[PDB]
Scaffold this active site. Structure first.
Site, PDB file in Angstrom:
ATOM      1  N   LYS A  89       0.487  -1.170   0.386  1.00 12.78           N
ATOM      2  CA  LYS A  89      -0.073   0.050  -0.591  1.00 12.78           C
ATOM      3  C   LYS A  89       1.065   1.447   0.122  1.00 12.78           C
ATOM      4  O   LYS A  89       2.073   0.832  -0.440  1.00 12.78           O
ATOM      5  CB  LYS A  89      -0.990   0.258   1.248  1.00 12.78           C
ATOM      6  CG  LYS A  89      -2.146  -0.932   0.813  1.00 12.78           C
ATOM      7  CD  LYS A  89      -2.626  -0.988   0.087  1.00 12.78           C
ATOM      8  CE  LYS A  89      -3.218  -2.273  -0.347  1.00 12.78           C
ATOM      9  NZ  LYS A  89      -4.828  -2.339  -1.703  1.00 12.78           N
ATOM     10  N   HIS A 108      -7.089 -12.416  -9.765  1.00 11.82           N
ATOM     11  CA  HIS A 108      -7.800 -10.982  -9.194  1.00 11.82           C
ATOM     12  C   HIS A 108      -8.694 -11.308 -10.187  1.00 11.82           C
ATOM     13  O   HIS A 108      -9.030 -11.813 -10.234  1.00 11.82           O
ATOM     14  CB  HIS A 108      -6.723 -10.536  -8.561  1.00 11.82           C
ATOM     15  CG  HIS A 108      -7.134  -9.136  -8.149  1.00 11.82           C
ATOM     16  ND1 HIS A 108      -8.187  -8.255  -8.830  1.00 11.82           N
ATOM     17  CD2 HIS A 108      -7.134  -8.473  -6.564  1.00 11.82           C
ATOM     18  CE1 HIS A 108      -8.679  -7.220  -7.495  1.00 11.82           C
ATOM     19  NE2 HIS A 108      -7.395  -7.682  -6.776  1.00 11.82           N
ATOM     20  N   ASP A 130      -0.390  -4.854  -5.735  1.00 10.33           N
ATOM     21  CA  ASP A 130      -1.815  -4.194  -5.847  1.00 10.33           C
ATOM     22  C   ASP A 130      -2.690  -5.063  -7.477  1.00 10.33           C
ATOM     23  O   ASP A 130      -1.854  -4.763  -8.503  1.00 10.33           O
ATOM     24  CB  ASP A 130      -1.809  -2.875  -6.058  1.00 10.33           C
ATOM     25  CG  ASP A 130      -3.251  -2.222  -5.012  1.00 10.33           C
ATOM     26  OD1 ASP A 130      -4.652  -2.475  -5.415  1.00 10.33           O
ATOM     27  OD2 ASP A 130      -3.137  -2.403  -3.440  1.00 10.33           O
ATOM     28  N   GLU A 131      -3.760  -4.891  -7.378  1.00  7.87           N
ATOM     29  CA  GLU A 131      -4.417  -5.298  -9.205  1.00  7.87           C
ATOM     30  C   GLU A 131      -4.098  -4.630  -9.740  1.00  7.87           C
ATOM     31  O   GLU A 131      -3.798  -4.722 -11.162  1.00  7.87           O
ATOM     32  CB  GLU A 131      -5.996  -5.658  -8.710  1.00  7.87           C
ATOM     33  CG  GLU A 131      -7.131  -4.760  -9.179  1.00  7.87           C
ATOM     34  CD  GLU A 131      -6.746  -3.954  -7.125  1.00  7.87           C
ATOM     35  OE1 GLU A 131      -7.244  -4.566  -6.835  1.00  7.87           O
ATOM     36  OE2 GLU A 131      -6.574  -2.516  -7.425  1.00  7.87           O
ATOM     37  N   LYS A 174       2.265  -9.306  -2.269  1.00 12.66           N
ATOM     38  CA  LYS A 174       1.591  -8.516  -4.221  1.00 12.66           C
ATOM     39  C   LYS A 174       1.794  -7.439  -4.225  1.00 12.66           C
ATOM     40  O   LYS A 174       1.405  -6.749  -3.672  1.00 12.66           O
ATOM     41  CB  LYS A 174       0.617  -9.154  -4.302  1.00 12.66           C
ATOM     42  CG  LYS A 174      -0.827  -8.903  -3.230  1.00 12.66           C
ATOM     43  CD  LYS A 174      -1.930  -9.760  -3.638  1.00 12.66           C
ATOM     44  CE  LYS A 174      -2.639  -9.920  -4.390  1.00 12.66           C
ATOM     45  NZ  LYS A 174      -2.914  -8.760  -5.098  1.00 12.66           N
ATOM     46  N   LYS A 184     -14.487  -5.517   4.604  1.00  7.36           N
ATOM     47  CA  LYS A 184     -15.235  -4.873   3.790  1.00  7.36           C
ATOM     48  C   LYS A 184     -16.216  -4.299   2.493  1.00  7.36           C
ATOM     49  O   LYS A 184     -16.592  -3.405   1.930  1.00  7.36           O
ATOM     50  CB  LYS A 184     -13.977  -3.409   3.346  1.00  7.36           C
ATOM     51  CG  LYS A 184     -13.274  -4.102   2.215  1.00  7.36           C
ATOM     52  CD  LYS A 184     -11.703  -2.725   2.284  1.00  7.36           C
ATOM     53  CE  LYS A 184     -11.017  -2.820   0.875  1.00  7.36           C
ATOM     54  NZ  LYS A 184      -9.291  -2.701   1.030  1.00  7.36           N
TER      55      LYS A 184
END
Ligand SMILES: O=C(O)[C@@](O)(COP(=O)(O)O)[C@H](O)[C@H](O)COP(=O)(O)O
Ligand SMILES: O=C(O)[C@@](O)(COP(=O)(O)O)[C@H](O)[C@H](O)COP(=O)(O)O
Ligand SMILES: O=C(O)[C@@](O)(COP(=O)(O)O)[C@H](O)[C@H](O)COP(=O)(O)O
Ligand SMILES: [Ca+2]
Ligand SMILES: [Ca+2]
Ligand SMILES: [Ca+2]
Lengths: 467, 123, 467, 316, 151, 123
Positions: D16, D135, D44-45, D42, D175
């Site tokens: 992040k 993903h 991020d997509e 990983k 979430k």
């Protein structure tokens, strides 16, 4: 035999000014027009250019003693003052064969013209001429085909060839390009071409243009019975892209492509030259950008050096100027480098700007192309200056004709044949030019309409580039 | 704000971030393996305790993953004292080795249990 | 909406002079220094340059009515007289986005600089600057790596990097090359390099040199504990040959190669730039030949245009000049184009020669390289002019040291760190430079010996290229 | 078997800020995460190749980082390098360089890339020994609403055919949306050889896989240490649990964040294995571990109040 | 210029709701039809969509301080209520040029439409329209031929 | 003519060719970092003090470039005594490590400062 290493700076002329040296026949010779800063003697200026385009730097280096500096050093061997000039000299510099990479114009320029033009100690520098030794010439392919083979492939003998750039330089679509190509070629032009800056763009992508221009050229060939060509441009952003365009032209079976050798560059141009030899394609070379380098007398490189470099790298055609049209070129200087492009041997001749005798050991000759601001009334002068072995191109002069492209082409073809017949019958093209043209207007309505439109048009200005 | 240490902080997969298993905690891990009807096996290793790449480097190839089998998998075992007994026998014979306990599921052909049961001096 | 076709010539300024045009944010803008012939008004001269670098020729062509000339035409939209000059103007020309080939510097130069410099109607022409719109910038890769990534690859932070060209320019053998590279790298330089003209030759073939320079660099890296590079030159006669050398450097696992982008050319250099991105190689760019084009104020192309073009085509380093050393470069003009090379945004600033506000939409920055006639006493000024993000190169300044290459390198590394420490501590490099150097000589015997040898050496001459 | 990992859920972590980090800062963050006890990190997509960080630099720095964390800890590590791209040629170029680096696992966005491209990459990964993390970016455009679209179970079955070793399955408690019984249903459809019609979990048809390999479900998005007990109860050993925010939001940095999550999960696994009930004793299990683990104690204080509880749109 | 790292969760609208922002001509713009869950204000809903389609996650991360969050963040810059609708808004979101891979529709959809449609805090989400800046258009080939060339 | 030595002449990038920093000189490097508004961070390493190539060999790949972070970068730090205090804490916990001070610029995402602040025994 080995003197001690002495650190520190000393004058260049102690090592690199060598007025007793006899040149070797394997040497590359350079004629530099040098303008030194106030307080720099010509010997030191000449030495500095020789040192820094060959083996030397600004301070003494111990590593010179591992080699033989005297067999590798470039050397200023002669200095001649320029008549009518304060503080300007012709310095002659000799470079040993071993300094250069075989087959590479890129490397030859990198040494001779690489860093010395920005020296603080000089106000200005121009490279005027190069003597390229026959042992270095044989390391290059030269033109893919050359003048003899081009005329034999195309079955065209006994007159200059005729071409034509399509107009609006930019902005036409692929199918309107082809429409214009067909109407030009069917009226008697041998060639049409892409404008130098037509590559691939939002208004017209390259593969669409190649394909419609092949349909159009084959239609004009079959109607007229004479072989036709359209120069398809391969100039591009990368070698891969350039190679893809030469490949599709090959696939279409057409006779000729084009490249912008200075804007594309010498590394890419040599690649394409080798491809066109391997695949039977004629290569037309456009010299876009040359005048950035070659316009001014005090600084740069003369066109004759850039034209020799093309002959080595390779091309079958190169633009040579017109003398009488819209862009600069003096008659005697032009005749000089036309001979350097077409012949096997050219003797030193300072009245045409030839500083060195130059031999080509059978490198094929390049066809000079005359283009830019010319029209039917120029035909006699153009035929007189270039003779049979040239291409004369009329873009505006064909697409600006009042009756359209076919009639515009007829006018140019009729004018040229009229000049050729008259010359062949003994008439003097310099003196009887306007009468030759005028006679042909009596039986050719198409030429008559072209003659009326451009009868007043001339391009006469003071030249910047004189001997 | 504490800094996670760097030196001599080698870890050993499942359960090795917990405090050292007591004898009761070790017993309960073996009960769990037996209660799920998995086959227990002991494995030991003296030379390459951790994974490394000597003979090859392509995706998914590592040396040091295979250890050596102590006897055979204990097919049909239902008694945790057997497993613990074999652990004591392995320890006595190889006091200088790392020893782990694994449990096999033969329907999935997957190890469902694996943990370090003994570590040699200085580990 | 369609007016009749009228054959014949008329003035360029009727179509191409357009003083009320507001520029689009997708346009390419050119600033041209134009010097017309006597009798050619500036409006017509400006119009002529715009027409002939975009859509127009010398007579009227009927094919204009198949397209929309007003959306494609280039156009002179502002004319400014040059103060202190008879008959010299800055003419501003706007070119629509659609005229250009995406990702091709070759095509952009071909249009803007292709034929207009040789017009009979002009005495001289110089392209001073270009506004490259962000929509065209995004069609290019830019540097393979750029400044941030280069420092992260090499683990080098908080000081200019140090380099060094191996001397005798030409004539050393492959093994003596690597011997010299080991001794230079081990004394504290980060980099050594091939001279711009060492490609492959009879005295030293390229593959042998690459191999020995790899052994030497790895030996210096292991001794010192700092990452080392040696710029291996890929410049060559053909794309195939150039590609073969970049391929062998890749195989040796070394960090950085070099190319001569103007002598190789833009088509080749864009190819190599794409290969270096694809293979993790740093790309050092040498500007050999630039001064043929960019030295004189009246004619050619300013270096800032050639530097912007390199940033688009791609390079991680480019030579920027030194200001104080043996080759020309004025301080303010140099600071201007260093900002154009390193930063994301540069505002119009005529006092540094920046004619146009230029944005880069995150194109990586290029590291400026200062090289040519510099030595330890220059270190303070060099550090002040360029700051941390530069490479400072000492060829003669290392291999001309009285004790050899290792001690040469120590002297340069010690001088630079002394300047960095003093700067960081608040000292003024411009005023305290000689005292900073002098203080370091008291504990560094290597620097003391370098200081003695070059204490009197300076390069101070009148500049040809001023604002 | 490739990773030598048995007896617990696997642990991962998305780096992040989603976008905006450089190639070298990506690798720095990867090393600190992996060294604290996570198995995976990983891309991020949406990290593909961009102006702030080009793909080949990122691959290279993430390899140095993962290999350094592996040597320090003694445990095999992986970082999911993303091959998602605009063209198949570009996609293939990235899988090729990952192969050259000798790393264990790559990732693909199968719906935004598409099924034609995804099947190509699935075949390349079988041919070259690469694990393939999938993903499901974009699935909720299609699968959120009960009246219109396609349920996720159909998209999950399609991925099992086309191919991937991991697919995101939802978390239930974090979430993003996912109801417990529907999720348990398609988790069985992804892992098992045979699943009987069961309308209470949304399974309309009995489905057989004739030994098609099972896909590991990945739970990610808004979860933290206090969720560990429930996650372990829902998914069991065969899952990956991923904490992006829940590692890089820890007060002491990435290593300590990773330790907290690893300790929490081991505490749950030990307690489950000893017979304790994870649904009822969850908070007590976490609380006990905070007495000997300072790292988990700091994580527990920061996120003690945080819950995601909203009405579901997708019900049986 | 660098504020301390503060661990923990805070509202999205503190960073990602930006009603005074003027759009850049290099921005991608999105018009989203957002239907929030009861009790979620439209500012927080719009902020949540912008954050999670660009740079943000659910709790505060220390690594924001290595970069410049304000130059990369996506941002909800305008909110318009839908006429005739209870709790439905058009939220306008801006995304900097640098977030996107050149020439990749795949990457553009991955960011803008990747994860935000399954947020628990929303009942429904529809992307109505996109403003594609000309600088990003030029990174694509577009049609192989197009209408003129086909005829 | 002096010969540049060969043995035990390892160097540490910026500032390592100068005499050893005095306490005042170290203080002034920290002031310079803070006066440019860069974020200070400490990094330390016990095992591989210099760069090497174990896992890969392609252009631009080296092992040993990453060291391990001491706590977190000191965002919002304006007081040099904090930086120097963390350096003392790092030294006390890792007396056998190499310790460096770096400063980040977040606009450029580039370290603008990096130097060695402590070296273990025999270095
Ligand atoms: O752009 C042009 O001007 C031309 O198409 C001629 O057009 P027109 O036939 O309509 O004049 C030719 O390229 C120039 O002759 C090039 O110059 P050069 O041969 O001197 O290099
Ligand atoms: O040939 C040379 O002169 C150099 O090797 C420097 O030699 P020394 O270090 O021994 O001076 C450099 O290439 C020039 O600096 C190039 O010029 P620029 O940077 O101006 O393009
Ligand atoms: O962008 C994100 O939100 C994540 O990185 C999680 O971030 P945190 O770990 O920081 O929450 C994951 O991709 C989502 O979980 C995807 O959703 P799903 O698994 O539902 O497809
Ligand atoms: Ca032309
Ligand atoms: Ca040089
Ligand atoms: Ca994500």
């Amino acid at each position: 035999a080995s003197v001690e290493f002495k650190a520190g700076v000393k004058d260049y002329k102690l090592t690199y000014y060598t007025p007793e040296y006899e040149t070797l026949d394997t040497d590359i010779l350079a004629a530099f027009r040098v303008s030194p800063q106030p307080g720099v003697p010509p010997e030191e200026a000449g030495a500095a250019v020789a040192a820094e385009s060959s083996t030397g730097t600004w301070t003494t280096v111990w590593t010179d003693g591992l080699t033989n500096l005297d067999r590798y050093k470039g050397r200023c061997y002669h200095i001649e003052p320029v008549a009518g000039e304060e503080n300007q000299y012709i310095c002659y510099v000799a470079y040993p064969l071993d300094l250069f990479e075989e087959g590479s114009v890129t490397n030859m320029f990198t040494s001779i013209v690489g860093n010395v033009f920005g020296f603080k100690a000089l106000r200005a520098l121009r490279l005027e001429d190069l003597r390229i030794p026959v042992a270095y010439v044989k390391t290059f392919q030269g033109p893919p085909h050359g003048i003899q083979v081009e005329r034999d492939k195309l079955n065209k003998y006994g007159r200059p060839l005729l071409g034509c750039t399509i107009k609006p330089k930019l902005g036409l679509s692929a199918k309107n390009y082809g429409r214009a190509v067909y109407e030009c070629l069917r009226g008697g032009l041998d060639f049409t071409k892409d404008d130098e800056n037509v590559n691939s763009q939002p208004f017209m992508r390259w593969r669409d243009r190649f394909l419609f221009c092949a349909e159009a050229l084959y239609k004009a060939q079959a109607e007229t019975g004479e072989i036709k060509g359209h120069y398809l441009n391969a100039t591009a952003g990368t070698c891969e892209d350039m190679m893809k365009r030469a490949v599709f032209a090959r696939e279409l079976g057409v006779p000729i492509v084009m490249h912008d050798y200075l804007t594309g560059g010498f590394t890419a141009n040599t690649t394409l030259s080798h491809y066109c030899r391997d695949n039977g394609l004629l290569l037309h070379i456009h010299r876009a950008m040359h005048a950035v380098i070659d316009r001014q007398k005090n600084h740069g490189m003369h066109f004759r050096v850039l034209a020799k470099a093309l002959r080595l790298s390779g091309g079958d055609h190169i633009h040579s100027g017109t003398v009488v049209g819209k862009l600069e070129g003096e008659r005697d200087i032009t005749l000089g480098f036309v001979d350097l492009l077409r012949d096997d041997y050219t003797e030193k001749d300072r009245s045409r700007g030839i500083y060195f005798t130059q031999s080509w050991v059978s490198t094929p000759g390049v066809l000079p192309v005359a283009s830019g601001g010319i029209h039917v009334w120029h035909m006699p002068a153009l035929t007189e200056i270039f003779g049979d072995d040239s291409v004369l191109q009329f873009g505006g002069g064909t697409l600006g004709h009042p009756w359209g492209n076919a009639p515009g082409a007829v006018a140019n073809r009729v004018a040229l044949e009229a000049c050729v017949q008259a010359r062949n019958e003994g008439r003097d093209l310099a003196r009887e030019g306007n009468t030759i043209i005028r006679e042909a207007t009596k039986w050719s309505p198409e030429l008559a309409a072209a003659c009326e439109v451009w009868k007043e048009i001339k391009f006469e200005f003071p030249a910047m580039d004189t001997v | 704000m504490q800094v996670w240490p760097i030196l001599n902080l080698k870890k050993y997969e499942t359960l090795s971030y917990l405090p050292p298993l007591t004898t009761d905690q070790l017993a309960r891990q073996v009960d769990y393996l037996l209660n799920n009807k998995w086959v227990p096996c002991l494995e030991f290793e003296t030379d390459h305790g951790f994974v490394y790449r000597e003979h090859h480097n392509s995706p998914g190839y590592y040396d040091g993953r295979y250890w050596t089998m102590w006897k055979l998998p204990m097919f049909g075992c239902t008694d945790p004292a057997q497993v613990l007994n074999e652990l004591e026998e392995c320890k006595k014979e190889y006091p200088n080795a790392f020893i782990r306990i694994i449990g096999f599921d033969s329907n999935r052909e997957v190890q469902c249990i694996s943990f370090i049961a003994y570590k040699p001096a200085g580990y």
